[PDB]
Design an enzyme around this catalytic site. Sequence first.
Site, PDB file in Angstrom:
ATOM      1  N   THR A 142       0.942  -1.120   0.000  1.00 47.94           N
ATOM      2  CA  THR A 142       0.000   0.000   0.000  1.00 47.94           C
ATOM      3  C   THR A 142       0.982   1.169   0.000  1.00 47.94           C
ATOM      4  O   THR A 142       1.951   1.162   0.766  1.00 47.94           O
ATOM      5  CB  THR A 142      -0.985   0.081   1.225  1.00 47.94           C
ATOM      6  N   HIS A 143       0.768   2.137  -0.892  1.00 50.50           N
ATOM      7  CA  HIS A 143       1.665   3.297  -1.026  1.00 50.50           C
ATOM      8  C   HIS A 143       3.025   2.835  -1.534  1.00 50.50           C
ATOM      9  O   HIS A 143       4.016   3.548  -1.389  1.00 50.50           O
ATOM     10  CB  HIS A 143       1.882   3.988   0.319  1.00 50.50           C
ATOM     11  N   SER A 264      18.145  -3.364 -26.319  1.00 49.25           N
ATOM     12  CA  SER A 264      18.402  -1.996 -26.769  1.00 49.25           C
ATOM     13  C   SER A 264      19.472  -2.010 -27.858  1.00 49.25           C
ATOM     14  O   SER A 264      20.459  -2.734 -27.752  1.00 49.25           O
ATOM     15  CB  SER A 264      18.897  -1.142 -25.602  1.00 49.25           C
ATOM     16  N   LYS A 270      20.698  -4.358 -21.676  1.00 50.72           N
ATOM     17  CA  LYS A 270      19.256  -4.241 -21.486  1.00 50.72           C
ATOM     18  C   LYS A 270      18.305  -5.345 -21.940  1.00 50.72           C
ATOM     19  O   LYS A 270      18.465  -5.934 -23.002  1.00 50.72           O
ATOM     20  CB  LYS A 270      18.774  -2.927 -22.098  1.00 50.72           C
ATOM     21  N   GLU A 277       4.781  -2.311 -21.046  1.00 54.98           N
ATOM     22  CA  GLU A 277       4.701  -0.883 -21.280  1.00 54.98           C
ATOM     23  C   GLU A 277       3.701  -0.568 -22.380  1.00 54.98           C
ATOM     24  O   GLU A 277       2.959   0.415 -22.281  1.00 54.98           O
ATOM     25  CB  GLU A 277       6.073  -0.333 -21.657  1.00 54.98           C
ATOM     26  N   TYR A 304     -30.301  12.527 -36.835  1.00 51.76           N
ATOM     27  CA  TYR A 304     -28.995  12.189 -37.402  1.00 51.76           C
ATOM     28  C   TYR A 304     -28.166  13.446 -37.734  1.00 51.76           C
ATOM     29  O   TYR A 304     -28.697  14.459 -38.189  1.00 51.76           O
ATOM     30  CB  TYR A 304     -29.148  11.355 -38.686  1.00 51.76           C
TER      31      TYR A 304
END
EC number: 4.3.2.1
Lengths: 447, 447, 448, 448
Positions: A142-143, A264, A270, A277, A304
Amino acid sequence: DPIMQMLSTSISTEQRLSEVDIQASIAYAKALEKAGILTKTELEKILSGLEKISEELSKGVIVVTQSDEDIQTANERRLKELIGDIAGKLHTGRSRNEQVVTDLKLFMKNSLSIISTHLLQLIKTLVERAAIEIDVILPGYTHLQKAQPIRWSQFLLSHAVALTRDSERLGEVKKRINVLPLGSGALAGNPLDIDREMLRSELEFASISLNSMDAISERDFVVEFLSVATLLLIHLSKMAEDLIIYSTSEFGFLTLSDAFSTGSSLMPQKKNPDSLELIRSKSGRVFGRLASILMVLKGLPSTYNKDLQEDKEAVIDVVDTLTAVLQVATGVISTLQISKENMEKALTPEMLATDLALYLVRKGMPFRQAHTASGKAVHLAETKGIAINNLTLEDLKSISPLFSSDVSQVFNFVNSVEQYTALGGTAKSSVTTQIEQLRELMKKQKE
Amino acid sequence: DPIMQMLSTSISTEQRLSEVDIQASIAYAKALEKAGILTKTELEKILSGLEKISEELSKGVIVVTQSDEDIQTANERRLKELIGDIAGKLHTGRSRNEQVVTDLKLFMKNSLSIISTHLLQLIKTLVERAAIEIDVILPGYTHLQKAQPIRWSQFLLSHAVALTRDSERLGEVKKRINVLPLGSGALAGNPLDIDREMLRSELEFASISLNSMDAISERDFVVEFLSVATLLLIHLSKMAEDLIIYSTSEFGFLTLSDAFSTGSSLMPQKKNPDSLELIRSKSGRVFGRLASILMVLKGLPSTYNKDLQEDKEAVIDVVDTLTAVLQVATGVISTLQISKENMEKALTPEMLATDLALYLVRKGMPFRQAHTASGKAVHLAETKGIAINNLTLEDLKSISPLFSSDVSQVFNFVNSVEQYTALGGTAKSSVTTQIEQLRELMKKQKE
Amino acid sequence: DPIMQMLSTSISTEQRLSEVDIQASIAYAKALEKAGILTKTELEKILSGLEKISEELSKGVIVVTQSDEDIQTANERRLKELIGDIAGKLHTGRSRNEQVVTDLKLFMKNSLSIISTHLLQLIKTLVERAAIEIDVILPGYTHLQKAQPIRWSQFLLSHAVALTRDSERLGEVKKRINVLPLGSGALAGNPLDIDREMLRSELEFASISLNSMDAISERDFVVEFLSVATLLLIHLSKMAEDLIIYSTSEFGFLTLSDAFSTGSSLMPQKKNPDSLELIRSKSGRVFGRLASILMVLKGLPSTYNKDLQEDKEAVIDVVDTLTAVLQVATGVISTLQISKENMEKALTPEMLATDLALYLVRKGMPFRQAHTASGKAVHLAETKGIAINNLTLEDLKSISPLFSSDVSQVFNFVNSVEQYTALGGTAKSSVTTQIEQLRELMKKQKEQ
Amino acid sequence: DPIMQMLSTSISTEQRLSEVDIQASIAYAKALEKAGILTKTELEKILSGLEKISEELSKGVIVVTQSDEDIQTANERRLKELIGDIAGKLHTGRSRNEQVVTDLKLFMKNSLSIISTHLLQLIKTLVERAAIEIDVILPGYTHLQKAQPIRWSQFLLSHAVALTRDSERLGEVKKRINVLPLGSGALAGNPLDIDREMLRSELEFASISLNSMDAISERDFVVEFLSVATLLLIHLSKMAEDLIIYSTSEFGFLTLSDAFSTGSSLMPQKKNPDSLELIRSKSGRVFGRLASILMVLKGLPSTYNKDLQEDKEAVIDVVDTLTAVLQVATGVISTLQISKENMEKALTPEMLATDLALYLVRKGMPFRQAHTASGKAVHLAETKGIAINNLTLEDLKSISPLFSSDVSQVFNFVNSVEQYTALGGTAKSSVTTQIEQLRELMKKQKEQ
């Protein structure tokens, strides 16, 4: 002017509706014969002609051209090319205003069935993995701060439960989408006493629209779809955030498979969680479509209006986006590798301060007071440079005489999670119950 | 620092949840006695204390203060003031993370019942007025251009149908809101083997959450409510646009009552449709709340995060907005005065060009060809400076010999609307059927 | 993982950035040779191939394929097919994170320039037409109710003024987009002491980015453009609403030309204002794009994240949308025909009720009471069948003894309008002044 | 029709505009006397009462009530209670349509000034701290994976750079808000030849509105502010995300002070970064306001429409939100404590793999192959338990004969960082330059 035409729906978008538009025209032609506007001789020529177009589309022939206003226009032009003037009778009493919503609904009907299937596989993937990894425990947050220990399966199920609500929302949207608007004409209805029951049956809708003006002015089905899809993507964006953080070397809880990661071209070391993402970014993409259509509809007068044509591109983009994201999410979850070693190692003593407090509660101390004592204990450890599970009984008694040698039983992570047996909790029996509830839920959804 | 505290929920917002929070605490205290944490002697002191607070709230006593973090904190502080240390036992195993969603859901449960009632009265107002004004005919529009004649009741029903779908969406949202999250603790569940079935029953939820982590991290109920409310406001914004345009002196179709209009402090002749404009503006206001919460949730990690506290103000604003807008819309529709004279007078010949085309279709001409001829007729009138209904049979025959003296029957507005008898159309029998379907729909919704 | 790539940008979107990518690569190549990474001979080869790829691009040749991640990798792969391993040297110190923002910025520089040209053309169209029809007077509205008489030209100019501010905002955004990000590397910068002033000069940017982490992690320049475009379309959605209502037969103030109108394949009498409707609808379309990027950016940690790749499609869609909407609006305003007759006919007496109250204020009666008197005059008129215009002096005398026979002078619309000479008002002289201010303002905006 | 009024703005919102409304009314009064509508004696009375209402306002007195439509009517009604019928003369030629935009603009002028002060203070805090901790080095991230080493100061500065652009945008918006709309009347302008240059001068605006219809129908100034604020909060949501992750025990780079953190009433060990979370959440909150006004404005016809009244609450909410968020962020950045130890410890060898490939590029090997070699070095390391840092020369020799013993020099983090001297890079000299550019940029922005 190629310019003003650039502002209307594109070729690829219109082409995506080519087959459902032909399907809608076939149903209409048949009702027109029943309504006495077409003889059986003419109906047959038209159906044969339309089948001709259906055949061409299946061969990858693109019928709509920049010259055509839309797929409706393109198919009508093509029919005329194939069978002559008789094609013009098919237009009798039909408006683009009803064809556009009929074709879009047919497309959505088909698209949602496919999306639904992939969504259930995603839910299933989460559920089945939760079953298998049920003994794994890691920190709950939490947090983004360590709160209390929970089962990794509790975490996986959290997302499955949220996705299950999305699946239910999809079903509800589908029922209102499954209402046939063909027969609404331009806004006043059909004037040939067309058999709408016949069209509904042939096109497979569950029912027919109640009001012709509404059927042609509304895009509730679109907004609703975009909205449900947006909340679904929100869920995925939160799950992606979770996995991206857990994929950091700092957390080290897990690693995505090579298939759902990329390297990368500059930095040789990497390994990036690209898939995650990308999924997260689609929430904004889909939300933009919802915002788009809501604004398009706001304040428009009945019935319309040409503005409404912005629905097509938004629906298609979201369908395609969803269809892809779902399979990728399924791929990500089924192939990722967790590090049970690092998850276990992340389990630190401080997380049991709440259990330490409850311990005192069991011995008669009010939680408020027990909360204080436990914090004092954490403080005492933090002060002598040690973990609370290391403090001697004596250091403990100096906080509260109520502490006894049994307090040792508090510093055990399995004991910690196992106290949460009340329905919904992270205890093993609760996780097991959840797995069963979701399997039944998924069974119902599929029905 | 009064500053950082300025960023958290306000006093009036927290106060709005004071009573449901007390109701939730009473249910919890009872389960705590059953779970062995409270003796009957203590439970009674706590219930009596909580009833004490419930009494004060009913007297208009504001319990929460800027000193208090939130209503939860304020009520716990107050209880301690009334009964001493025993109040602290009530906190046992309870987290603000579950109390916040429990209190919000209880509030929404109550608010939606009230909103539902007002929405049905709005729908009813539209339906009952459609029944009474069933014989009125005026122009129907597409692109804000006169299309074909339709019944004013068809127009009123268009909006009732759309609002009826909103009513159905409200019901669906209500079922997912009606799931109890109390017993989820901070994220891991409750550790006292609390009886969640007991809490569900006492607080009147239909069921209990399946996963503790999800129950505390999600705000689907909020998004869903805001989304349904937004689509509802979109419908009202379109109806407001319609009535505002019809209220112009140029259209002259109707006039709002003095109660729902205002004048100008500068221009003495003005009578403005304020009510309508206000309603239209709320669509943006409510949409902003939806956009707000969607963005707040996007990309947040599991489980609870302080960001989530933005839901409270958004929900309350939307509830209040909706509650007010609905009654105002009901007021506007029931009290406005239509000018049947101006609606009738707006019925011009050109609107029957489609009927004129169908006339030729009935005589064997393909619609495509008939469409052309009718336009040619409108062109011929437009060229001789007259209305198509004025052209002599001879001028007509010069367009097409198929025209016969019976063509005269085409230029009649009642005949025009009456051809649309197929379900959903503007014919009187279809409008009547709609009125019956909506009365049954409203009956079902109310059930 | 094909479907994963289905989440990538489209081949068409990447193709859209092909020329700027080659242009950006050409600059980096020269800066590389200067940095000693490339021999003067290795440069000539690399540069030679780049021009080749450029020739293919100009011939419609599509180099990006489904296998290529983006346009950058396509060009590298293509260049390698042209000159071999040597093309790999171009990669030294370079990151896709800096190339995407560089490419997108180059694209926006070229696109914004075109958009400005069209925007200023739209404003001029409104301004010039305003000058020509300056004598036309018609109803002014608030709450869509007849308020006070104004000049058609005041109306046209209010829209031109709003659009002029849009143009001003567009240029301010132009300045921030015109900062070069090339040389920020993956996030830390460039380790070859690459000459950024050289890159800047060659790619024609006004200056270079101040911080490498910020440069490859921010998309402010995207958000700004979308914000400015959105507000611009809001203005257009309002102008469209106006003309669409003024196009109704009920209002009958004007009619769009056939080129910007369209019929109905069902209703043979229809003549619809499609151009205006299409324009209004793009407000939602562009707003939707602004909303998505804001959401994409929200809560993202530093520095680069793959999420950012959504900027391209949103930027391209808004560029093409705005470019077309502006030209359509220009044609609409230019070719529409107004009905001086209907606009004049619309002028109704009650719209002069304010002037009527003012007439009493000049005679000493307090505004509040005068307002009330005017109110009664209009009510007295309606309940009497006639308009305040025809009320006898006695009738007016019945409302207030201050009403003399010179009140007749209040019932003149030109006079009404000519009353507003204070700057910005609807009096002729004021409209004329506006026309000059906007002519100057457009002149000042072009010269930069 | 009470509930109808429930749709109005709140008493608190209207009260918020009380002082600017009195100030605007004071200017119009003097311009009225000059226009001959008010005797020098009637002015003194009116002005006398206005100052009285002002004194009540300063004493917390709330004049607006549930019965009053808005603050404007409240003040008129109040002034009438103070001086009688004469207060009614203030109304001559004035419309609420121009008063609301005048009042809201005055309010935004005063509020924006305060926001700028705090914004610039936040930037300075980031800048100064950046100067002090300039030697600290830690991991730089892309996709939240360790990328290349950067300076903590580069990190702090990237945020300061983004916020500096926000400040620049805020000033540009300031200019457009600073145009006086008073004198546009209900839409047609003012019919009393009121002196707008006088009003402007007294209300302290930089210039006056060009067209009366535009002035009372537009809310661009509202949209702009909200757009700029939204983007500003996006930057803050990103900085918050960063610090929230850096605050985790997993990362352990820094810890917020107790003043900007909070505990848990259930879990006694908790120490949460509330301040940061609250800040991140306001991004959605402010974006929501931008979204509503855009929707309010969309498709609305000219000129004034009651819909526009939604601007006030959105503007006020964003003003108070931004004002508080900025100070909280300043306190957060100022008082947080970083762990140089943990930041240094986080520096892992694989992050130097790029430098390692570059080492081979200097020896002649083509970047592509060098990249591949570095890749194998890191894989060879991991599968061997150690890091590329400990690999023997032989091991490296096994990957490429180009690896000599001088490769050891690549494994140094200061050197890594010091490699980026090109402008904007993370090298010390570059960070130092940034600090100076921002110091100057903040100086330039204050002087206007």
